[PDB]
Design a protein around this ligand. Structure first.
Ligand SMILES: Nc1ncnc2c1ncn2[C@@H]1O[C@H](COP(=O)(O)OP(=O)(O)OP(O)(O)=S)[C@@H](O)[C@H]1O
Ligand SMILES: Nc1ncnc2c1ncn2[C@@H]1O[C@H](COP(=O)(O)OP(=O)(O)O)[C@@H](O)[C@H]1O
Lengths: 344, 7, 331
């Protein structure tokens, strides 16, 4: 049933700018389900576990891929958070609660829940930082999660009980997608491999050029680098598949403002349409916006700042203004040097 | 309640 | 129940290129486990507690030896690290997390440690903290461990628990060279380190005494508790090729099985395998990082293999490893 060719096209409809990452997920997703079709029946013994490790910058679409995949996929999907997770459940939460929410989506169907997908956001949150210690969000969380990720049956009261019984739902079959923004990881990889600082005439020095630090550096990531970050090596050993996402290109940004149905121009113009005046954006403004956005280095999430701040003056006085049929925005408006000219 | 650790 | 000859055969099934290391573990494990059976019935009471020390280059399978041995003998094993330490209690509870309930069953378990050279005494709170702290740990003691996290504490003896301190000692070869082999490397007549990769440094490590480890940074009191010493050899280029085929379970076998389920045959040519070895050498990750190269190289093929139709067999050319070509598909 799974198709790697079609799934890549489907993700392209909702995600843009990450072509390599789509290929990685299609292989792991196809392999994981194929394994369950014939479980441990092949001649090959000790088959490697198929897991996913999403790693990319902010606004790269980590949370977006989990949403799009859930809609396209038939099995139930869940969206949890690592910040809420706590060890030995004092007042925050428990690891077993993740399984309870999965059944609510699957309507207490063990046969249908074991084939489900799991996605945990902000994986970096559980990084073990116990230099000055007890720790409720550090080693305790990762230790409990590793036990679950290893594959074990955990007691879960079905429906809560009206019984003193619990179901032994398997865990090795269920898939897991550990993803989150890694801050400081680039420095760790750069610290290990620099291959520079040559003072000789023959030697070369690169101060601004960083050999595509946003994308190339991620491609050369190793498990040993994450160990210094704080993660446990056994946790990384269980995830042979890692996804690397490069920084969005200026071309990709333009596509994100036009092709998607959640585009800023579409919603903002729709909002202006309610007022009664149409909104027009030229192509020259779009490429200009992309350059400013990349400078901020905030991702797509910070794109809105440039568009809104530029239109702050226009929206403030637009209701008072009358007899304006359409609004025209030029490239200079993005810079802010020239005010936009209205159409009557 | 909470945890304190410094030097 | 097993014997040194039988365990050696089992060890050889999943490990290769380390012959001396097999004999060390076989007698140590057989003798150590023998103590558990006899107990104190014999006249020689207070017997046992012999530690094992492993020193070798990264990617030699030091960790694999413990994990493979744990599977062969079906004994619980944990893989803890000493780099995190600046706790000791974490190490003891870690082993218990395997079953969460062990009174007379976790005492016979095994533990492995990685990056033992990091704790070397620099001359400096980062180093020498751990070695003084590990003394009481190795010598045996009992530590409180809440079973399952919870309201009664559990006491577990550590003397029976065996320890295997794994690690890599870079630069150690030069230290012994000036002391035993010869004082050279900088002079004209003095032999330079020309054979960086032409010859294997391993032979020199075979003459490693505890006194040489003191100059590296270790404490003599810490080394005295680990009398056994293992000198793994430098991983060979052919060994990587053997690892892909000779072991019981290899990446090629696993990949063949996956495609076998799909219904397509998988074949890897000898020329392709040698190219992979050269790439792995540059990474300096040995076998541990070899899997990464194969995953990326076959990612494109794996993506299009299900979409492709009537492909009876897959032929992988050596150019594919280079990255300038695609593998041939047999219909
Ligand atoms: N790759 C992308 N392509 C297009 N739009 C994107 C992309 N990434 C983010 N966006 C936009 O930003 C919004 C929020 O994206 P998110 O996926 O939540 O960002 P995020 O950084 O992945 O979140 P985190 O870091 O995982 S909490 C989306 O609704 C889109 O409008
Ligand atoms: N002889 C061998 N046969 C099969 N695999 C091996 C062998 N030697 C090393 N490996 C691989 O190396 C990995 C373990 O590396 P390890 O010895 O832990 O490196 P380090 O000692 O630097 O931590 C395992 O995943 C294992 O598959």
């Amino acid at each position: 049933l799974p198709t790697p060719h079609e799934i890549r096209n489907h993700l392209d409809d909702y995600v843009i700018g990450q072509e390599q990452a789509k290929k990685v997920l299609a292989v792991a997703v196809y392999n994981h389900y194929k394994r369950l079709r014939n479980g441990d029946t092949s001649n090959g013994v000790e088959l490697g576990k198929s897991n996913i490790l999403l790693i990319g910058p902010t606004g790269s679409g980590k949370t977006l891929l989990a949403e799009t995949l859930a809609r396209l996929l038939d099995v139930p999907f869940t969206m949890a958070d690592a910040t809420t997770l706590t060890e030995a459940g004092y007042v925050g939460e428990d690891v077993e609660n993740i399984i309870q929410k999965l059944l609510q989506k699957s309507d207490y169907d063990v046969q249908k829940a074991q084939r489900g997908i799991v996605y945990i956001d902000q994986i970096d949150k559980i990084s073990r930082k116990s230099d000055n210690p007890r720790d409720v969000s550090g080693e305790g969380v990762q230790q409990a999660l590793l036990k679950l990720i290893e594959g074990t049956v955990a007691a879960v009261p079905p429906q809560g009980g009206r019984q003193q019984e619990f179901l032994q739902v398997d865990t090795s079959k269920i898939l897991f997608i550990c993803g989150g923004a890694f801050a400081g990881l680039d420095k760790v990889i750069s610290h290990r491999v620099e291959t520079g600082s040559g003072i000789g005439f023959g030697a070369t020095v690169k101060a601004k050029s960083d050999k595509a630090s946003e994308g190339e550096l991620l491609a050369q990531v190793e498990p040993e680098d994450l160990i210094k970050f704080g993660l446990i090596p056994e946790f990384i050993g269980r995830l042979p598949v890692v996804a690397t996402l490069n920084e969005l290109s200026e071309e990709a940004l333009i596509q994100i403002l036009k092709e998607p149905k959640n585009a800023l121009t579409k919603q903002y113009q729709a909002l202006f349409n309610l007022e009664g005046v149409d909104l027009e954006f030229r192509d020259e403004a779009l490429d200009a916006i992309a350059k400013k956005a990349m400078a901020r280095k905030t991702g797509a999430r910070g794109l809105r700042s440039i568009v809104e701040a530029a239109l702050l003056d226009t929206m403030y006085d637009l209701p008072s203004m009358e007899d304006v049929e359409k609004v025209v925005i030029d490239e200079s408006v993005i810079d802010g040097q020239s005010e936009p000219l209205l159409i009557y | 309640x909470x945890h304190x650790x410094x030097x």
